[PDB]
């Protein structure tokens, strides 16, 4: 029963996970990866310019 | 919660004691001996419940006597199931393999 | 009080946790923000349980 | 790359949330790590997750030791010996779990 309630909480932890998927560090790391891809797209844009 | 799955199914009512409830079943076969479990296909699912079990000869023989023929047992192959329902009290309403 | 240590104000909207103030907040401040957010969502889950 | 990073962070956070579960149930390691991998897949792909397929099924509880659990099965047949796998037809599909 302890493991049953524990795995119930672990399954409910999807809310914790997808709420962490909009946190400050999430935004920071997504923005730095997007900034790498964005500087790639930029240098492309300015070369075409 | 559905009432259709939590409503007790009326198998057999009183026989007033006298005469005793006698059920002769010359067609001794598992669906008629041990009863049947029906299957209503609602919304496309073969959803069953406690309300879809039909009493057999054994169910309406309770408190009385069940008359059976030896031919209808050793011929229809229900002798083993019958003797298991007798010795072990294992009355199982039969269902189709589907 | 963690935010007001550096002089930063807070405006939370329930699920969303954020603070108002010019300039970048300290890294420890953001770490505490995320820790508090995770704890709040967890305690929410155990309150439904 | 963002999908992979989300999977990695799911792995990290669920390692944090599972290590107490790992020590609490030492011999349930395989099931817990499989659940963690499934949650990582949920994070990376957005694949829907159902509790009905990831909830352990209670087979048999304690018999208090004495008397020992004795099960006489005079009807020795495969469905009654080795158990049965039921099939609920939800939405029209014979979906099992």
TrEMBL record, chain A:
Coiled coil residues, start to end: none
Origin superkingdom: Bacteria
The family this protein is said to belong to: Belongs to the peptidase S16 family.
Protein name from the UniProt record: endopeptidase La
Organism in which the protein naturally occurs: Meiothermus taiwanensis
Lineage, uppermost ranks: Bacteria, Thermotogati, Deinococcota, Deinococci, Thermales
């Amino acid at each position: 029963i302890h493991l049953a309630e524990a795995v119930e909480g672990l399954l409910l932890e999807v809310n914790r996970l997808d709420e962490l998927f909009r946190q400050g560090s999430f935004l920071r790391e997504k923005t730095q990866l997007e900034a790498r891809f964005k500087e790639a797209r930029e240098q492309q844009l300015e070369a075409l310019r | 919660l559905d009432p259709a799955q939590w409503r007790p199914n009326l198998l057999t009512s009183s026989s007033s004691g006298t005469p005793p409830p006698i059920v002769y079943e010359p067609y001794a076969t598992a669906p008629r001996l041990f009863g049947r479990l029906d299957y209503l296909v609602d919304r496309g699912v073969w959803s069953t419940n406690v309300s879809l079990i039909r009493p057999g000869a054994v169910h309406r023989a309770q408190g009385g006597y069940l008359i059976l023929d030896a031919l209808s047992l050793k011929r229809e192959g229900t002798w083993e199931a019958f003797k298991r329902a007798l010795r072990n009290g294992q009355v199982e309403p039969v269902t189709e393999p589907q | 009080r963690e935010a007001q240590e550096a002089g930063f104000a807070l405006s939370t909207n329930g699920e969303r946790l954020e603070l108002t103030g010019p300039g970048p907040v300290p890294a420890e401040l953001s770490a505490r923000l995320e820790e508090v957010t995770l704890g709040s969502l967890a305690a929410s889950a155990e309150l439904e349980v | 790359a963002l999908r992979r990073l989300r999977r990695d962070w799911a792995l990290h956070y669920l390692n944090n949330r599972f290590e107490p579960l790992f020590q609490r149930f030492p011999q349930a390691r395989a099931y817990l790590e499989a659940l963690r991998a499934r949650l990582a897949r949920y994070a990376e792909t957005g694949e829907p997750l159902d509790p009905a397929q990831w909830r352990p099924n209670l087979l048999t509880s304690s018999s208090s030791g004495t008397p020992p659990p004795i099960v006489y099965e005079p009807y020795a047949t495969a469905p009654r010996l080795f158990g049965r796998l039921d099939y609920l037809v939800d939405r029209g599909v014979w979906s099992t779990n």
